[PDB]
Amino acid sequence: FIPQFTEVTIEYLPRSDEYVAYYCGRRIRLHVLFPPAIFAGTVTFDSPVQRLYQNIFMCYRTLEHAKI
Amino acid sequence: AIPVHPTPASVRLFEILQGKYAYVQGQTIYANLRNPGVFSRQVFTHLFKRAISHCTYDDVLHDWNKFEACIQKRWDSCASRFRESTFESWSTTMKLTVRDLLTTNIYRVLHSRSVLSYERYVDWICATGMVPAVKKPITQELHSKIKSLRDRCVCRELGHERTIRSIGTELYEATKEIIESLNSTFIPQFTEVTIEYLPRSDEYVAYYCGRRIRLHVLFPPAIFAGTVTFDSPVQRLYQNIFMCYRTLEHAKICQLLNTAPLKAIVGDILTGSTASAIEKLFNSPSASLGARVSGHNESILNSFVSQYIPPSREMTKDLTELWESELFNTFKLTPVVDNQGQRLYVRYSSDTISILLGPFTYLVAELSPVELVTDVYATLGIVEIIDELYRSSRLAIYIEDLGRK
Amino acid sequence: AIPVHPTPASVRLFEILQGKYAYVQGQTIYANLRNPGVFSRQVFTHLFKRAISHCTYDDVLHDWNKFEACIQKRWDSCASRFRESTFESWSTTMKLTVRDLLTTNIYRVLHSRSVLSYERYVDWICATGMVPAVKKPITQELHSKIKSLRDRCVCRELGHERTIRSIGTELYEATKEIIESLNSTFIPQFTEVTIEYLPRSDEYVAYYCGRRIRLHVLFPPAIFAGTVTFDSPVQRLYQNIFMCYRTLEHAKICQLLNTAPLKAIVGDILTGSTASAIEKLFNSPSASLGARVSGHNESILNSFVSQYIPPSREMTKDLTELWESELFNTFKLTPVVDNQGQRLYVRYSSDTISILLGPFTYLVAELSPVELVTDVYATLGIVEIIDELYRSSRLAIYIEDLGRK
């Protein structure tokens, strides 16, 4: 089974680094492929979309700015 | 002792691995060489080569003899061309019967969990020219994922071919020798480990979990008396990337500061009913702009207006092909293109596997008996390289030896 | 005594090896000739030649004789073309069974830790025309990294081929003489060592940890009474690169200085809610600009406005092809291109290996018996040069001598 995103969540513990899935209150199995960069202030994911992320948000900002 | 990893300038360099500060179209090709899979192709054709090498000629000639003994009880002068045709079909199903079982077992052993990641490798060498070589002693996964009968369940058929009964077992134990070497090794992430260099009696010391771990210099970084610079593809573009980031945020700053339609000096929003959307921002203070002099006695003689657009997308566009030229040059990437093709098939070269997986598979990964590959070993289909290996294999040359009787 | 290395102008010159001050698309091609691996091609095909030469014709002819003795117990008038075909397949597996042996062993000895690097050489010659030749006496790593049986356990098989049992040992011990010569030598970095010139009774002095080291002039510098100039590729561009850097930082200065939309004379930001983003910088003092007259009695008769954009990207664009022409010319680089190709395959030439690896492998490296390569020795694949060497190799001409019986 693969779920959607909007009602399940995923948890990472930095201390003794593992990852914990959750859906209806249980830890479910998981598979790392692209492990994210956890800095002390934020976590960014090595992903195709987050390699574009703030450029897409910049384009959104200037488009709403243009309509403003 | 002077730090290498967790310095602010070095982690500013390590950020461009991801896209957090600046990103252009040319940086899309950076993940293209960051694609793993060329490493799987490496070990994939290597252990096919290891399987096809240890075969003997005497195991297959009496196999063809017993194959003819099978067909004589099922089926004189016409039997000459009958035996030629049934040997031709026997060669075709020989290629088939090696290909099917081999691609099952090898895609099974290959796509299990491997803690070694080429994805985790290629980002380091282009960032710093340094690799953290970690030897994780936990190696109890291979007997758990694939122990026995995976080579035996698929081959239990009528025709007891001793060729597969000799070679599948030898490759099956051989895969346990090769997956061991790769999952025993480890390349980590960057945001939690560190690398350290000392000036006096200079060595480079890798540190994760409080211990000196192995490592290899690949591109010797320049440590000046005030700063450290890494001979790296990314830091060769470093302040041009940061200058483009600066002028882009500068451009949006001036764009966001000149939004008033009129300049005075003192002496749900995205979609809605446009009539009310007029009202919801006309009362807003975004419309007005009255600039100020600090001193009230301080007076102004004259005033001028100049909105200014800095060439933002012009500064992005040339830095795209800046990235393109640099990652075509220091990593040999030949774009396989059509007539006026816009860079449709970006592929590894001959020498760029010698400069990426050349050091990788032999220095930071301790894979001794593996080889590098060709252009068409990596270009062609991953099952279409199997029969191409077969086209220059020891067994099929023995079969083409049998090709003339 | 006059300094050469640690002077401020020459370390400004040594910086542009890396990307710290100015960088354009033309300087991407600098890493392409900075790529090592062509040096591995050098020692690769040289030890190939040292392997393939030391055969005897008498070894392979009786090897074919015993090979026929093997096949007569396994398999009359048809035996004529049978013996022709089995010799053809025997030549094919002869190429195969030398090739897999050499491909393992020579990639194994090839990708060792080599403290000599082409990367540390090519930057030094193009910077100043001078290389420091260091003879570092520790040479104990070869016996530890490779001792015995790496040439043997791969060939421990049924057919005791005396061709590999004669030639693999000699190529094995030959690598022990060749990797010794390269790892005995040393080319250093720049940021810790220095080069020094005495004008009086002129020689050049090298230094690392207080000793005069060996060294080799290649492009003799111009030593004037005020400064030193080096006949080099990068110092032939030096103040043009600095001029482009100066006008680019000046361009950013004027761009940052004319950001105000309105000119008075006295007398989180990257992404956010744009309605609040207006508010966060309109109150900021970046918006206003009131220009100053120094004297309060000093009055102003007339006042002007002129924003000015200097041609920044224009100054980058011609200097790109400035770098391209210089690194196409003083290092002979022939771009293998397609019809209207955008410089897709930038490759070493015939004569540029004689001007770079020519002096390298023979003057600072004391690799005496090694040879240079062809165009198609460096162009073609590192496994596809094996069979091309085989197409003109003494063993395979002896097999083509056997090609007619």
Numbering used by the authors:
A (entry chain G): 206 to 273
B (entry chain H), C (entry chain B): 18 to 92, 96 to 287, 434 to 571
Give me lines lifted from the publication on this model.
Epstein-Bar virus (EBV), a member of the subfamily gammaherpesviruses that also includes the Kaposi Sarcoma-associated herpesvirus (KSHV),2,3 is the first identified oncovirus. Similar to other members of the family herpesviridae, EBV has a characteristic three-layer configuration: the outer lipid bilayer envelope containing viral glycoproteins responsible for host recognizing and membrane fusion, the inner pseudo-icosahedral nucleocapsid enclosing a 172-kb double-strand DNA (dsDNA) genome and the middle pleomorphic tegument compartment fulfilled with 20–40 different viral proteins. All herpesvirus capsid shell consists of 4 abundant proteins: the major capsid proteins (MCP) constituting the basic capsid skeleton through forming 150 hexons and 11 pentons, the small capsid proteins (SCP) binding to the tops of hexon MCPs or both hexon and penton MCPs, and the Tri1 and Tri2 forming the heterotrimeric triplexes to plug the large holes on the capsid floor. Once the viral dsDNA genome enters the procapsid shell through the portal that is located at a unique 5-fold vertex of the icosahedral capsid, the viral nucleocapsid is joined by the capsid-associated tegument complexes (CATCs).
Based on the density map of the C12 portal reconstruction, we built an atomic model of the portal protein BBRF1. The first one, located at the interface between the stem and crown domains, is the channel valve formed by 12 copies of β-hairpins protruding toward the channel axis. The channel valve is the most constricted region of the portal channel, with a diameter of ~25 Å. Similar to the counterparts in tailed bacteriophages, the channel valve of the EBV portal should play key roles in DNA retention and ejection. Each β-sheet is formed through β-augmentation between a β-strand from the clip domain of one BBRF1 monomer and a two-parallel-stranded β-sheet from the clip base of its counterclockwise neighbor (viewing toward the capsid interior). The portal-DNA interactions are contributed mainly by four basic residues (H79, K90, R155 and R176) of BBRF1. Compared to the in vitro-assembled EBV portal, our in situ portal exhibited a more compact conformation with gradually decreased interior diameters from the clip region (31 Å vs 31 Å) downward through the channel valve (25 Å vs 32 Å) to the crown region (58 Å vs 75 Å). Consequently, the terminal DNA of the packaged genome in the mature EBV capsid is firmly held by the significantly narrowed portal channel valve, which would further alleviate the pressure placed on the portal cap.
